[PDB]
Amino acid sequence: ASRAACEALKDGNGDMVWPNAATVVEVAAWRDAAPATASAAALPEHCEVSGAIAKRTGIDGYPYEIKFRLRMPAEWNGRFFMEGGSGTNGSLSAATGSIGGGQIASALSRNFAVIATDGGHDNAVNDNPDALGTVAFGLDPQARLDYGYNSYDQVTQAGKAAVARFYGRAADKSYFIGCSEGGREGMMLSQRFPSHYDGIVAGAPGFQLPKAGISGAWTTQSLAPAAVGLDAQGVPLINKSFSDADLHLLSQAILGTCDALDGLADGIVDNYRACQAAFDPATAANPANGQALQCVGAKTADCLSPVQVTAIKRAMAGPVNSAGTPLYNRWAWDAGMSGLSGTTYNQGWRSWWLGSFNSSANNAQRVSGFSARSWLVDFATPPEPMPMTQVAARMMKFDFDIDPLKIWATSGQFTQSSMDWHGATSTDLAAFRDRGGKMILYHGMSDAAFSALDTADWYERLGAAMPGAAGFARLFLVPGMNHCSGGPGTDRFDMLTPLVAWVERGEAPDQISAWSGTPGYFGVAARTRPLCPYPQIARYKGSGDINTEANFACAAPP
Ligand SMILES: [Ca+2]
């Protein structure tokens, strides 16, 4: 481990042999120790290796390759680390090792050898203006296979080869941490390549991402009756269906109905199952005056329109076809759909289905943004690129009897369906568990991108196929937490420490310490709570400060 060993990986006559012959290294530079800053932990002396694998040309004429960045510390804990992606990937991160949970420390700051990838395409090169911008990679079938599983496999094999070459020995254990799309990766790793990583953290995982566009079309068509006004193309303004004050009224009614169902009134719905059975906005009341939430006469700032409650109920039910078959899943009611801290309302929930209120056009993720564009180009087979101005209308005429079949369809050179290369719904985790693999999953209740109930349903099927699943896999649902972060909940936590303590040392996480990044939702300076493994919830012990984990334990729901 030295500077010369770092630069000898930059091709030359050196004996660094890559598993894939098509691996090309651009950068191999020795980096000095960066002292800690106010927002990041100290990074040690490390070797940075940057390169690309499988440089080719797609069937669309665009150049494709699988980029990687690798940082290897001089003082190394013998452990390997890969961080997951986000969105449709296409960008190469700093490769310091984000562990999620709003953490100051990075994996590299903890002396891990860190690797990262771009997914098999670049957002600067593969930006076709006739194929909905940065999702244009979906026009080439191999770029889909790289975004699905191939790129992460290839980068993992190259990273371990370089680690073994630079350190003279193989990594002891390998760990992966990803949120959203990176959470889908982590589950895909445990299923397609169980031998690669010993510990895996998958947060808010989109293990059914090709289905999010179907829910997005259902969302749009359910809320359109409540929409007020048209945009430049005559599409209803979904963002105008609910004001930010309206959403706060809804989250307040959920709080008035389900907050005490866990045994404590604290602005947190810890008994999510009891809320689904108890809450119905058509019958619930506004806790601020005891009157009913659904308006009896004309709309006021103290009531929701009957057309509004109907719309949100249909959206939360989940998409179905005329045959009644559920196309995705239903969503959970939770207080994290809104939230007012200081001046700002919570946008972490409405930004997916509705969009920003003060906008004369649609800007919801599922109406015209990246999510709807991604389904049209990357998840549907054959892909249907189009002008951006027509994506909103495409989600308005979405036929739930013809269009949902495109995520299982195959056509021409697109030899694999999107649910085949992107899906991660398998419960075949025996090979992963039996070699010592441990997996931690977390998901917020107020996640509008992916349903936490759907993650729980997968966790139930895993426990059915493999008795004793809690010995290698636990699910930690987070109340109030939005997608990956934000909302009135404890969204900050260190998940790399328990993951290491589980894989090695064999200590199962009976709970996970967590605190709130914005405690002002509850009007306090700080709030710390334990995250409990499914299906346990946090139970108040009966005395002490309600903003300290020491007064809370993990118990079965009351
Ligand atoms: Ca509570």
Side-chain angles (χ1 to χ4, degrees):
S2 64
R3 169 187 290 115
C6 178
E7 298 169 314
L9 315 172
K10 196 181 340 161
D11 189 80
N13 299 291
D15 278 65
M16 170 60 196
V17 194
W18 298 90
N20 188 334
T23 300
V24 185
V25 175
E26 262 182 329
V27 191
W30 186 252
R31 291 337 163 101
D32 230 353
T37 66
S39 53
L43 304 169
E45 206 150 49
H46 74 271
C47 171
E48 187 203 342
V49 177
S50 195
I53 322 170
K55 200 285 157 183
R56 53 180 187 80
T57 317
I59 73 159
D60 44 357
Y62 281 76
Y64 295 90
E65 82 217 326
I66 302 174
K67 298 173 137 89
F68 70 89
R69 189 164 272 139
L70 164 76
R71 290 178 205 274
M72 305 196 274
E75 265 162 330
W76 182 51
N77 54 17
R79 306 198 171 91
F80 199 60
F81 184 90
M82 173 163 223
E83 70 176 55
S86 174
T88 39
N89 296 348
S91 63
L92 197 59
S93 85
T96 49
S98 178
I99 65 187
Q103 289 304 289
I104 293 325
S106 52
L108 180 53
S109 85
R110 302 204 191 172
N111 295 296
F112 282 72
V114 183
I115 186 167
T117 176
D118 73 328
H121 58 279
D122 188 350
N123 291 333
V125 173
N126 299 107
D127 190 337
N128 184 257
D130 307 330
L132 286 172
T134 47
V135 295
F137 74 97
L139 293 194
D140 166 47
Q142 182 55 63
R144 285 158 168 239
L145 293 194
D146 301 329
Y147 174 51
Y149 59 90
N150 181 35
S151 80
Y152 320 103
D153 179 61
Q154 295 290 311
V155 174
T156 299
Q157 301 196 9
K160 294 198 182 188
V163 156
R165 177 59 176 169
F166 178 63
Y167 293 117
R169 73 168 185 292
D172 302 339
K173 297 302 185 100
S174 295
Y175 302 90
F176 183 100
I177 293 178
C179 202
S180 199
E181 153 68 15
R184 175 214 74 83
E185 280 146 39
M187 301 178 74
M188 182 263 326
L189 272 305
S190 69
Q191 295 157 31
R192 271 176 184 269
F193 324 95
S195 181
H196 277 358
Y197 296 104
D198 307 85
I200 294 167
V201 178
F207 63 95
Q208 261 158 351
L209 214 356
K211 290 185 189 177
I214 310 167
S215 166
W218 188 265
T219 278
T220 318
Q221 296 171 35
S222 294
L223 293 170
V228 193
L230 273 36
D231 61 333
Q233 292 94 41
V235 190
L237 288 178
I238 308 303
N239 61 297
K240 290 292 171 67
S241 55
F242 286 91
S243 69
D244 273 289
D246 282 328
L247 284 193
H248 198 271
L249 218 56
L250 181 78
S251 75
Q252 280 291 310
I254 295 158
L255 275 186
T257 309
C258 314
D259 186 354
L261 289 180
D262 73 332
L264 179 61
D266 40 332
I268 283 177
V269 178
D270 272 301
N271 204 334
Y272 41 90
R273 294 274 175 231
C275 197
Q276 307 318 300
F279 183 71
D280 176 14
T283 71
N286 178 19
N289 51 2
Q291 327 264 45
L293 168 141
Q294 183 168 315
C295 306
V296 178
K299 172 79 158 67
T300 183
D302 314 84
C303 77
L304 289 174
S305 324
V307 202
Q308 270 176 317
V309 50
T310 294
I312 186 53
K313 284 173 85 166
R314 197 182 124 103
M316 291 282 259
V320 290
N321 50 14
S322 34
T325 310
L327 306 184
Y328 179 50
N329 214 342
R330 81 288 182 211
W331 307 80
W333 304 93
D334 206 48
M337 307 205 220
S338 88
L340 194 47
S341 189
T343 291
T344 310
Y345 272 114
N346 188 17
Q347 300 294 286
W349 185 90
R350 67 169 304 132
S351 65
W352 290 94
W353 300 5
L354 284 65
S356 306
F357 195 69
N358 55 16
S359 194
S360 55
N362 282 304
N363 37 294
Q365 273 277 289
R366 293 289 157 82
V367 170
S368 50
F370 291 153
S371 196
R373 299 163 205 172
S374 191
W375 188 95
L376 287 167
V377 187
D378 321 324
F379 298 142
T381 303
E384 38 202 85
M386 67 181 72
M388 303 209 123
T389 79
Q390 303 192 313
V391 177
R394 182 66 182 84
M395 293 297 133
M396 277 269 100
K397 74 169 116 74
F398 196 102
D399 195 296
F400 294 94
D401 303 295
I402 309 155
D403 289 319
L405 295 159
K406 291 192 179 65
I407 74 183
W408 311 93
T410 184
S411 179
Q413 297 195 244
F414 300 97
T415 60
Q416 229 167 314
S417 83
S418 71
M419 292 286 325
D420 274 332
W421 49 260
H422 221 38
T425 60
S426 182
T427 66
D428 187 359
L429 279 312
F432 177 74
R433 148 200 86 183
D434 278 5
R435 66 175 304 278
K438 307 295 169 188
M439 166 185 261
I440 304 180
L441 308 97
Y442 71 101
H443 204 159
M445 279 335 291
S446 314
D447 198 318
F450 311 120
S451 193
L453 301 189
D454 195 46
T455 303
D457 269 354
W458 181 87
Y459 188 70
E460 289 264 43
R461 291 193 289 121
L462 180 75
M466 329 185 43
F472 75 95
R474 278 142 184 238
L475 172 62
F476 296 93
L477 303 173
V478 198
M481 180 176 163
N482 287 134
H483 181 66
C484 280
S485 75
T490 53
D491 58 307
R492 307 259 182 94
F493 33 69
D494 174 13
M495 215 97 69
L496 186 60
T497 286
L499 177 72
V500 168
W502 204 3
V503 174
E504 335 170 28
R505 298 193 263 141
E507 301 178 26
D510 295 323
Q511 45 181 248
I512 291 185
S513 291
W515 64 97
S516 179
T518 311
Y521 286 118
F522 321 111
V524 304
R527 164 166 298 189
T528 59
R529 297 287 191 76
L531 305 171
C532 296
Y534 188 90
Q536 306 192 301
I537 86 184
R539 175 163 151 80
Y540 184 47
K541 271 160 187 170
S543 62
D545 191 17
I546 68 170
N547 300 307
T548 312
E549 331 161 338
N551 307 319
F552 292 86
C554 289

